[PDB]
Write a protein that binds this ligand. Sequence first.
Ligand SMILES: O=c1ccn([C@H]2C[C@H](O)[C@@H](COP(=O)(O)NP(=O)(O)OP(=O)(O)O)O2)c(=O)[nH]1
Ligand SMILES: O=c1ccn([C@H]2C[C@H](O)[C@@H](COP(=O)(O)NP(=O)(O)OP(=O)(O)O)O2)c(=O)[nH]1
Ligand SMILES: O=c1ccn([C@H]2C[C@H](O)[C@@H](COP(=O)(O)NP(=O)(O)OP(=O)(O)O)O2)c(=O)[nH]1
Ligand SMILES: [Mg+2]
Lengths: 128, 128, 127
Amino acid sequence: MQIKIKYLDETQTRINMEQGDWIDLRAAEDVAIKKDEFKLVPLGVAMELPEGYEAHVVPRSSTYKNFGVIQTNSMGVIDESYKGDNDFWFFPAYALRDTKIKKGDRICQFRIMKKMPAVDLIEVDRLG
Amino acid sequence: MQIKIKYLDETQTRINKMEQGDWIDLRAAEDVAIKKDEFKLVPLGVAMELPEGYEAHVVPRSSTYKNFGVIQTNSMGVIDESYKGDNDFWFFPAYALRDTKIKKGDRICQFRIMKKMPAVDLIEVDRL
Amino acid sequence: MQIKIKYLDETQTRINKMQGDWIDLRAAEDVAIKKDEFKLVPLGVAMELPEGYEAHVVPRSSTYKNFGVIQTNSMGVIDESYKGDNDFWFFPAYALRDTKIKKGDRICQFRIMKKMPAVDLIEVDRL
Ligand SMILES: O=c1ccn([C@H]2C[C@H](O)[C@@H](COP(=O)(O)NP(=O)(O)OP(=O)(O)O)O2)c(=O)[nH]1
Ligand SMILES: O=c1ccn([C@H]2C[C@H](O)[C@@H](COP(=O)(O)NP(=O)(O)OP(=O)(O)O)O2)c(=O)[nH]1
Ligand SMILES: O=c1ccn([C@H]2C[C@H](O)[C@@H](COP(=O)(O)NP(=O)(O)OP(=O)(O)O)O2)c(=O)[nH]1
Ligand SMILES: [Mg+2]
């Protein structure tokens, strides 16, 4: 199973695994964020995911410790269909304190996972 | 694979975007106003009987923070197959980072289903 | 399918068997957190998961109203790799109000999941 991945540019740090571990993604540019402010931290990457698969994106264990940001959407769902040449991943960050992220910083991690199977949604007037 | 769904009332907007594999959006069952640093359970006006052996996972949409200034306090909501009774309506536990207003009908979060953990024996052991 | 689990001390309340359900985990000691402050809440447990699996840890839906805390990493990911006698799970809590969590309190919950299959990251210039 392969993932095709476009980098924003040559300065981005490429990421190498087939170990099953979640893969760290990194900030594409310096972002500074005041306490109680919001910013998209661009991750400088676009990917074509395997057919029938999602990416899930959550912070790293140490993200809060080292940057004082929480992830606004809790968990990011990157769908297989987000595979365009301008479809760059971002990390939506709310700073609970003054913070600076530097280009290259590892700020979140992801894995892939089979989309849910197909499903008939059937309205009913009463449940058991 | 089918899910039964019951709606609080005819007012509610059927979520008739059954899966092409994608997560599915849920909507505020009523007008809800939440002030800065206030918490509210936002009712989603749906009860469901998930497939045997499954659970549902709920998370915010990508734009939920931009548009309503709320985060989901439980990060990823877990809904077990057993939450299927006739009064088991889904909610969105929302904490507000600014003064905000959700209107009835609004898409505020999204779900998919996924198979439960297989059974597991838990052994206590002195060391590892 | 088997998980080997090691409690911190005798004091800790062992957990029941279960069925596929997320298992609740308990705070290992009383912890007080002021508004707008962060603290790791020990869950007094370390575990050897199955070869090829990870654990996901998230709050109960009631953690906020009962205890006033969110989990700053959203969902903790614990790898098969974290299986040593000192590898004790924690709940990273940030308090949005003053709060005292009390030993024994069930504050978050977990399950296991097969890890991602092996994949190739093939760099490309266009998509
Ligand atoms: O944390 C995230 C979350 C989403 N994303 C990406 C994936 C998503 O496809 C895109 C946002 O554009 P839309 O809001 O239109 N996508 P959406 O999730 O709304 O898809 P849909 O409308 O199909 O439900 O941002 C991230 O990069 N990081
Ligand atoms: O975001 C959510 C999360 C859960 N739920 C529902 C489904 C689930 O069966 C029920 C309880 O979930 P939790 O286990 O996370 N909270 P708690 O453990 O307090 O409830 P219970 O004691 O029933 O397990 O609430 C929601 O409607 N929205
Ligand atoms: O909420 C959490 C999250 C992680 N953990 C555990 C598992 C993890 O291995 C450990 C943190 O160690 P590291 O800082 O080395 N992070 P991790 O092992 O995930 O990094 P890598 O991606 O290199 O494995 O804490 C918790 O107890 N609670
Ligand atoms: Mg529970």
